[PDB]
Design a protein around this ligand. Structure first.
Ligand SMILES: O=C(O)c1cncc(-n2cccc2)c1
Ligand SMILES: [K+]
Length: 536
């Protein structure tokens, strides 16, 4: 019995299976392909999914949602603290941990965000078990690419509590790229931008995919922007439209506002395929019927700042990834709000007409990729960057990873100390900033350098890779022609596919700490005489 991929989203969750060469997204008991991430508690029962979201108006103090916003955080976290000012349900400080507090069958009960989300995994489990007719245990579950090891572990804990064996935790932008098979496209490396706009969150992620390996170069977004905000703009417009045409403010009637919000979400769906949408609400306030219309143009005007604003996280991420928008090879639309025609055009205009990858249901694509990965775990170019130690144990790359073979690349270095007699050349493998966090391939001395002031001697290191993967590293003293070389054996299978992933992921986890370290040294390709990692 195969494994499942689950997208445990902030507001909605989704479950997929790869069975007999096809990925199927599994509907819930009420026929929905997506289930609200809501756990409602009452005097009698525990509600999960649609029935919990459906009773929110009756039991808002005991209905929990947005548990992804607490999961793996301190109670004192600024996001936690401010986020509470919008949640009808109670959050409390147990030993510096958030715990949502709720009344369940007369008694008061407290749950950790892992437990809340575990109940959502329990529902997705049962939904797949009803579809598949068999117990499901093995599952891949996705997380936002910006999640820290504490939030990934918390998510895994929710799955384990749920009775799930979590085969692996993968980033939502990577699953989305998997879904679209971007890792099976030939050619050099590829940069992918994932534009993910859900009901409540916005995430932009830039990835590079070469030889089936994914590195997340950058993440930007807005954790408090989503389709609900667009609905909110519609709601306020119509409330003022009612006040202007009926001299009545409906907002102090709670049921009246809800019915309006519900009308507005419907029309926003219509305005993705039509240029106009109707509002037909009987007896909305004080017996007045509200029958009116909103054009897509008026809808776009109400969300002009919000729609154009999404290009800023797009620009930040291209910046942080040190890429020009001309260097993106694929754009993936993810999230149901990416169906909004204006969102699509903005992004497409910003990318000079580039087509958008959007043929998979953007609500489903993350679970779909997560299902491709579950079945995989269930049943050329250089692998790593190559470089030498410069002053400070710093990694100075000469052959970037994913570079085609055979290649030859050369750089000129200099001495760090005055009258340096020699440089010790130390070849390294890896994507970390410091050589100590990388793999030492070989060492050799270049000696007999004519004494001079620091930065005057010229040392030309060349990296040469034939087509068998035989790396050859040589240094020439430019003032005399003296040279030395090392030949590095290409051991077949020395690194597994998963070995490369661990190195790439460590550079992803510490990219910031590595960033600052690269900045601190001013060597600019100076070479010392000793191994930096062996000095007292
Ligand atoms: O979630 C949204 O913002 C959204 C916007 N436009 C259209 C849809 N839509 C249409 C058919 C199924 C979903 C959803
Ligand atoms: K997820």
């Amino acid at each position: 019995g195969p494994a499942v991929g689950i997208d445990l989203g902030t507001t909605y969750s989704c479950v997929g299976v790869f069975q007999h060469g096809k990925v199927e997204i599994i509907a819930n008991d009420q026929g929905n392909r997506t289930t609200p991430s809501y756990v409602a508690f009452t005097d009698t029962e525990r509600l999960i999914g649609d029935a919990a979201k459906n009773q929110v108006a009756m039991n808002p103090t005991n209905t929990v949602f947005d548990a992804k916003r607490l999961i793996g955080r301190r109670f004192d976290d600024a996001v936690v603290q401010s986020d509470m000012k919008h949640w009808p349900f109670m959050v409390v400080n147990d030993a510096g941990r958030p715990k949502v507090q709720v009344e369940y069958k007369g008694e008061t009960k407290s749950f950790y965000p892992e437990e809340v989300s575990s109940m959502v995994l329990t529902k997705m489990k049962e939904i797949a078990e009803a579809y598949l007719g068999k117990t499901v245990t093995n599952a891949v579950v996705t997380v936002p690419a910006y999640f820290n090891d504490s939030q990934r572990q918390a998510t895994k804990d929710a799955g384990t509590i749920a009775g799930l064996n979590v085969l692996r935790i993968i980033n939502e932008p990577t699953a989305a790229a998997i879904a679209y098979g971007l890792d099976k496209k030939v050619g050099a490396e590829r940069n992918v931008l994932i534009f993910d706009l859900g009901g409540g969150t916005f995430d932009v992620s830039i990835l590079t995919i070469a030889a089936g390996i994914f590195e997340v170069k950058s993440t930007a977004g807005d954790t408090h922007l989503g389709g609900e905000d667009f609905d909110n703009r519609m709601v306020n417009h119509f409330i003022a439209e009612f006040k202007r045409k009926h001299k009545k403010d409906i907002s102090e009637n709670k049921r009246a506002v809800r019915r309006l919000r519900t009308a507005c979400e419907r029309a926003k769906r219509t305005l993705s395929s039509s240029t106009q949408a109707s509002i037909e609400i009987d007896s909305l306030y004080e017996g007045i019927d509200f029958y009116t219309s909103i054009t897509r143009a008026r809808f776009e005007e109400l969300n002009a700042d919000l729609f154009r604003g999404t290009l800023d996280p797009v620009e930040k991420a291209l910046r942080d990834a040190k890429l020009d928008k001309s260097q993106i090879h694929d754009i993936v639309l993810v999230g149901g709000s990416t169906r909004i025609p204006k969102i699509q055009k903005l992004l497409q205009d910003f990318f000079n007409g580039k087509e958008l990858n959007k043929s998979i249901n953007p609500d489903e694509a993350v679970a779909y990729g997560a299902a491709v990965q579950a079945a995989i775990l269930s049943g050329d170019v250089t692998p790593l960057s190559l470089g030498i130690e410069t002053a400070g144990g710093v990694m100075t790359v000469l052959i970037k990873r994913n570079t085609t073979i055979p290649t030859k690349q050369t750089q000129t270095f200099t001495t760090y100390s005055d009258n340096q007699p020699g440089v010790l050349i130390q070849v390294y493998e890896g994507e970390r900033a410091m050589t100590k966090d990388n793999n030492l391939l070989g060492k050799f001395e270049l000696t007999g350098i004519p004494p001079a002031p620091r930065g005057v001697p010229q040392i030309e290191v060349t990296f040469d890779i034939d087509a068998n993967g035989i790396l050859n590293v040589s240094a020439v003293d430019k003032s005399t022609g003296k040279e030395n070389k090392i030949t590095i054996t290409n051991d077949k299978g020395r690194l597994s596919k998963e070995d490369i992933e661990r190195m790439v992921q460590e550079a992803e986890k510490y990219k910031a700490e590595d960033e600052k370290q690269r900045d601190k040294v001013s060597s600019k390709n100076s070479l010392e005489s000793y191994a930096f990692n062996m000095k007292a």
